[PDB]
Design an enzyme around this catalytic site. Sequence first.
Site, mmCIF file in Angstrom:
data_model
loop_
_atom_site.group_PDB
_atom_site.id
_atom_site.type_symbol
_atom_site.label_atom_id
_atom_site.label_comp_id
_atom_site.label_asym_id
_atom_site.label_seq_id
_atom_site.Cartn_x
_atom_site.Cartn_y
_atom_site.Cartn_z
ATOM 1 N N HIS A 173 -7.208 -1.080 4.674
ATOM 2 C CA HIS A 173 -6.158 -0.276 5.248
ATOM 3 C C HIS A 173 -5.902 0.974 4.397
ATOM 4 C CE1 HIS A 173 -2.766 0.819 7.697
ATOM 5 N NE2 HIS A 173 -2.165 1.123 6.562
ATOM 6 N N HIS A 188 0.815 -1.207 0.000
ATOM 7 C CA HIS A 188 0.000 0.000 0.000
ATOM 8 C C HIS A 188 0.842 1.247 0.000
ATOM 9 C CE1 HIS A 188 0.309 -0.294 4.488
ATOM 10 N NE2 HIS A 188 0.130 1.016 4.451
ATOM 11 N N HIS A 223 4.794 -5.324 7.776
ATOM 12 C CA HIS A 223 5.439 -5.396 9.088
ATOM 13 C C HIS A 223 5.596 -6.868 9.472
ATOM 14 C CE1 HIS A 223 4.957 -1.082 9.879
ATOM 15 N NE2 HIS A 223 3.963 -1.236 9.028
ATOM 16 N N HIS A 273 1.421 4.018 1.580
ATOM 17 C CA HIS A 273 1.740 4.882 2.704
ATOM 18 C C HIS A 273 3.245 5.060 2.846
ATOM 19 C CE1 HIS A 273 -2.336 4.427 4.998
ATOM 20 N NE2 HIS A 273 -2.357 5.419 4.123
ATOM 21 N N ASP A 309 5.460 4.532 5.075
ATOM 22 C CA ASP A 309 6.316 3.494 5.641
ATOM 23 C C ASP A 309 6.460 2.247 4.761
ATOM 24 O OD1 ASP A 309 3.650 2.848 6.355
ATOM 25 O OD2 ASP A 309 4.308 1.680 8.105
ATOM 26 N N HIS A 310 5.857 2.268 3.562
ATOM 27 C CA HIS A 310 6.039 1.179 2.596
ATOM 28 C C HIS A 310 6.422 1.634 1.207
ATOM 29 C CE1 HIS A 310 4.765 -1.268 5.850
ATOM 30 N NE2 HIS A 310 3.714 -0.479 5.982
ATOM 31 N N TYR A 323 -8.344 4.939 12.818
ATOM 32 C CA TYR A 323 -9.386 5.172 11.808
ATOM 33 C C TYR A 323 -10.762 5.261 12.453
ATOM 34 C CZ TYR A 323 -6.184 3.421 8.069
ATOM 35 O OH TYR A 323 -5.139 3.210 7.212
HETATM 36 C C1 LIG Z 1 0.449 5.292 11.494
HETATM 37 C C2 LIG Z 1 1.765 5.720 10.884
HETATM 38 C C3 LIG Z 1 2.531 6.717 11.501
HETATM 39 C C4 LIG Z 1 3.751 7.123 10.948
HETATM 40 C C5 LIG Z 1 4.236 6.546 9.773
HETATM 41 C C6 LIG Z 1 3.470 5.556 9.163
HETATM 42 C C7 LIG Z 1 2.239 5.164 9.706
HETATM 43 C C8 LIG Z 1 1.553 4.076 8.969
HETATM 44 N N1 LIG Z 1 0.711 4.138 7.896
HETATM 45 N N2 LIG Z 1 0.358 2.813 7.527
HETATM 46 C C9 LIG Z 1 1.027 2.043 8.394
HETATM 47 S S1 LIG Z 1 0.966 0.282 8.321
HETATM 48 N N3 LIG Z 1 1.734 2.790 9.230
HETATM 49 N N4 LIG Z 1 2.519 2.370 10.221
HETATM 50 ZN ZN LIG Z 2 -0.500 2.200 6.013
HETATM 51 ZN ZN LIG Z 3 3.159 0.154 7.808
#
Ligand SMILES: Cc1ccccc1-c1n[nH]c(=S)n1N
Ligand SMILES: [Zn+2]
Ligand SMILES: [Zn+2]
Lengths: 266, 266, 266, 266
Positions: free
Chosen positions: C159, C83, C224, C85, C87-88, C190
């Site tokens: 997600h 996805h 993760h 976001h 962090d990916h 969410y």
């Molecule tokens: C919730 C969050 C905070 C900071 C950086 C990334 C994220 C995030 N988005 N999707 C996911 S899975 N995250 N950990």
């Molecule tokens: Zn995410």
């Molecule tokens: Zn993530």
Amino acid sequence: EVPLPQLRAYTVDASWLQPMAPLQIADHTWQIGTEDLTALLVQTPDGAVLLDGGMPQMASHLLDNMKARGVTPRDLRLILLSHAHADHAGPVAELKRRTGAKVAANAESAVLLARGGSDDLHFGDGITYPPANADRIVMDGEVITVGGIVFTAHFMAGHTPGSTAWTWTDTRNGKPVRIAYADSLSAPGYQLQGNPRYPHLIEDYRRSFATVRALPCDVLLTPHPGASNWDYAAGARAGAKALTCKAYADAAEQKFDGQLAKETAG
Amino acid sequence: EVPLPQLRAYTVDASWLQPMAPLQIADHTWQIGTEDLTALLVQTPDGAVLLDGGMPQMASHLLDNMKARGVTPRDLRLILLSHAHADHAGPVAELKRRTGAKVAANAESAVLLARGGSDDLHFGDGITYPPANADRIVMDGEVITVGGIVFTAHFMAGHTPGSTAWTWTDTRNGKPVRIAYADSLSAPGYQLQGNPRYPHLIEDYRRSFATVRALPCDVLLTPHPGASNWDYAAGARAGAKALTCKAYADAAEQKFDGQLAKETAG
Amino acid sequence: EVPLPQLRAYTVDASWLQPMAPLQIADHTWQIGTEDLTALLVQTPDGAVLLDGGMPQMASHLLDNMKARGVTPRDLRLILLSHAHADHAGPVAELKRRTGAKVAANAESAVLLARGGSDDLHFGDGITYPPANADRIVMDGEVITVGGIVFTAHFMAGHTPGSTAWTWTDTRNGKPVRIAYADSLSAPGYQLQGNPRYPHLIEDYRRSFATVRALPCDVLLTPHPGASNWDYAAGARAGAKALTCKAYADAAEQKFDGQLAKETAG
Amino acid sequence: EVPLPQLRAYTVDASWLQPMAPLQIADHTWQIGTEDLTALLVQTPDGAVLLDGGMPQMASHLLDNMKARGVTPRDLRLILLSHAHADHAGPVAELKRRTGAKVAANAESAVLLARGGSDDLHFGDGITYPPANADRIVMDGEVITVGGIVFTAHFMAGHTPGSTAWTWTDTRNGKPVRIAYADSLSAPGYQLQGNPRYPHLIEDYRRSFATVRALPCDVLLTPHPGASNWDYAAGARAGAKALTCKAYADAAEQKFDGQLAKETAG
Ligand SMILES: Cc1ccccc1-c1n[nH]c(=S)n1N
Ligand SMILES: [Zn+2]
Ligand SMILES: [Zn+2]
Ligand SMILES: Cc1ccccc1-c1n[nH]c(=S)n1N
Ligand SMILES: Cc1ccccc1-c1n[nH]c(=S)n1N
Ligand SMILES: Cc1ccccc1-c1n[nH]c(=S)n1N
Ligand SMILES: Cc1ccccc1-c1n[nH]c(=S)n1N
Ligand SMILES: Cc1ccccc1-c1n[nH]c(=S)n1N
Ligand SMILES: Cc1ccccc1-c1n[nH]c(=S)n1N
Ligand SMILES: Cc1ccccc1-c1n[nH]c(=S)n1N
Ligand SMILES: [Zn+2]
Ligand SMILES: [Zn+2]
Ligand SMILES: [Zn+2]
Ligand SMILES: [Zn+2]
Ligand SMILES: [Zn+2]
Ligand SMILES: [Zn+2]
């Protein structure tokens, strides 16, 4: 009762659409487009570069010529453009889908390419083609290197805001050959003076004549071979009558001056 | 064991983030940004124009000042930009979502804005902001009209390739006031000479000094008020000490020459 | 007087940013990301595929691990994403600039990636990263092939709207291993019920639990590692405790049901 | 010797291009397109919404009909789309340039619109039009409000991945009228089974039949009036023969089943 008109596709001279086999220009550099549209393949130890693709319907032909030269779709690394009109960037979107190729272009060419030539300063939506995205934006004078072959962008705004001459040094007969691929300096049907969409059009063309005049230029090639007096159908004599960059710039400026005078008279 | 570093947000002086009430510059033209970041609201019989928005966190403040001036979100028609860095175009994406505003910009500014300032020629991904799309691309010298107020783009490449001065004529005391909103002529931490990402940087800055020098310029404003010696906290004296466009260009060129000399020495 | 707040960068646990050497998962498939962020390298006779890149600051690390595996920047052909976001997909724009890689993604992921995660349905502009363009749009169930290795997209919206599980068959010990790379089924902070930006959020998560449950899944990996009980720091035991796709889906649904109950109570 | 073929513009029946005066559907809602292409104008106390524009050459006609209805270019706030093919989204880019209109669409429609219909799942580059950008991305079931009129998106993937039905409640004769604007459920020349570009095509159409069946639907309108048995040339009887949403869904499913059977036989 009278319906709105049907959409009209832009038609071109048959020669612009006439496939030809690869024609060698220098040790690494081949014309692989049609009789009357340039598409330059530069083959390096690290993959190939394509300068222009011609019209939208030329993609498959280009790929077949690349295969004949030993360049597989994976091997095509880079696409560069003279300008982002349908008759030069036509097949770029399709080439990107069907090969490994990424596009490098200036911001003006990138914007025009991304809208598939729509909302053209002069043509409106008359001459559209499949949009494509640029992968790298280049600045005036910036170089891009593939397999050790170095290509330099020379901005020559006018025909389009993003019109570019591309230069590189190949070899022939153990000697360097400084190749200049200069964009069109035509202004077909353009309003030159007081054009609200291009207020400094004339100053830009004038600067571009000077830029073209001064290119490193042992051999000039142009998007339309006829512009530089190439005849891709003429075999061993294809490049015999070719203009210098100086003569190309001068002839284009003379034509431009004539057009300006006729516009004033019009 | 040592992890990769955390991402670092760009911080700025508190004054850049200090909300201020609308400050009138001319009959139609108001400063509505912060103490130290310009955001110009031009109010017309046909809706409003915003020139710059400042930092990304300023959107709500801008909207509140617009409301105080009688401009509802629907009424904001156009956003223009000095340059597409985070501290001037920061809130543009959010403003577009929250108002009727469309963006007009040159191709260079549009490309940089669409990537949210990422892959900056000098900053890399150090200073990013939410990307936004341009609705209209403008050429050098092109005019854009809202409610009869005519804004002219003057390209002044250097600080960014797409850096623009915007000019318009407002009124004060029954008299015309030719307002010039000139972009930054800083080069903060830039490599000026032999920069592969901007080979003609120096020539572009020099041309831009000349452009700024020659703007129609009864009153100069700048993205950072301090650049032109505005003090938005100074009430009736805010614009008293303001530089002419000529003096701004000269001071910026002197600073640039110094930086070039120090770079050569460095 | 109180200025607007400084921008705040999203910080993450150190382990998410902790470089690790390549960890082999199957004959062609390696974890090359960090201790706590997955980045899968799949090496084929025709170039390499990367599934996810982790955070924006991981680009160089990824490239170094690719080099250690014998994959040069030219050799990276394709980037796929769980996805879009930060962090990916964080380093995707930079990877595209620095390698031969093209991106394939669904329309939802492409739209989110192109805006660098800004205007997120839940996060707003809280978690942004450099935008990137997709080169190919994929549909649910569509396959993409590189060096004969076939990857199948399984849409598992929730997600993010564009959340995708990617499946492929590698080998280990002369035996096929059907690898499932399932996206996150978290909903961190969410609003699940009656969310105007995602009205059918709950129905989409429910469908996605069923999709994940039914994946071809000899081995589950997740963006993760902890989500699927991988421990990339555990060497030969890294994957010993790994959940089945069935158990991952069930645990995620149980957690989701709990969150829904707590939201109703909240 | 045989040149590559000239580009061919897609031609359509004259009736699709036949201008008509505004035809009132309900208190706020007018058909302003052609005899055989729907373009719905919804007029509110806060500006107007356009649902579809028809073919690329219809922009000026639409603007003239808007003017006749008292909607100036400034007053057009929002463009919504059934699907992003040339015969419905054709003039969207031009409308955006010439009016205040912003576009809201789902991610699939936005992606297709941004490429001007090129690389279509079924049509390839056969049916292209000027690309346009979306200003807001909507999710299934999401509402968008203009001048208090609330429009709800109902995703009905199949004809295109992003095909959408739009619903709103207008009034007639002091009574509410729940209007459903349902997209095409045709599959013209499509490969339905085992289509690598759309693997779940059949399941999506089936779901879409059910979605259409269940729309709030006092009055059904369709992008092609004939699909729902409207006759825009029939004056006071234009909507007399109109199908219910239930009957439209059923007829479309019966046709689809026939096409599937013929494809299997083919
Ligand atoms: C919730 C969050 C905070 C900071 C950086 C990334 C994220 C995030 N988005 N999707 C996911 S899975 N995250 N950990
Ligand atoms: Zn995410
Ligand atoms: Zn993530
Ligand atoms: C003028 C024209 C008509 C149809 C197709 C292409 C063109 C064109 N644009 N730029 C150049 S050079 N052309 N020949
Ligand atoms: C991998 C990829 C994705 C999108 C578009 C093109 C490609 C590609 N890379 N090399 C070759 S050959 N491709 N077709
Ligand atoms: C140099 C810098 C640091 C943080 C945020 C913004 C900037 C900046 N870019 N252009 C200008 S003018 N800045 N102040
Ligand atoms: C209608 C619309 C769509 C996308 C983004 C913004 C808008 C809009 N127009 N006028 C106002 S106020 N909006 N928020
Ligand atoms: C050629 C090119 C243009 C833009 C972005 C990336 C690239 C590229 N292709 N292969 C490699 S390695 N590149 N950096
Ligand atoms: C099938 C076709 C041919 C030419 C122009 C448009 C179309 C078309 N796409 N979607 C629909 S509905 N069409 N009629
Ligand atoms: C202000 C603007 C910029 C780009 C495209 C359209 C417009 C616009 N807003 N309202 C009207 S009428 N326009 N033409
Ligand atoms: Zn041209
Ligand atoms: Zn041409
Ligand atoms: Zn700046
Ligand atoms: Zn600044
Ligand atoms: Zn269609
Ligand atoms: Zn149609």
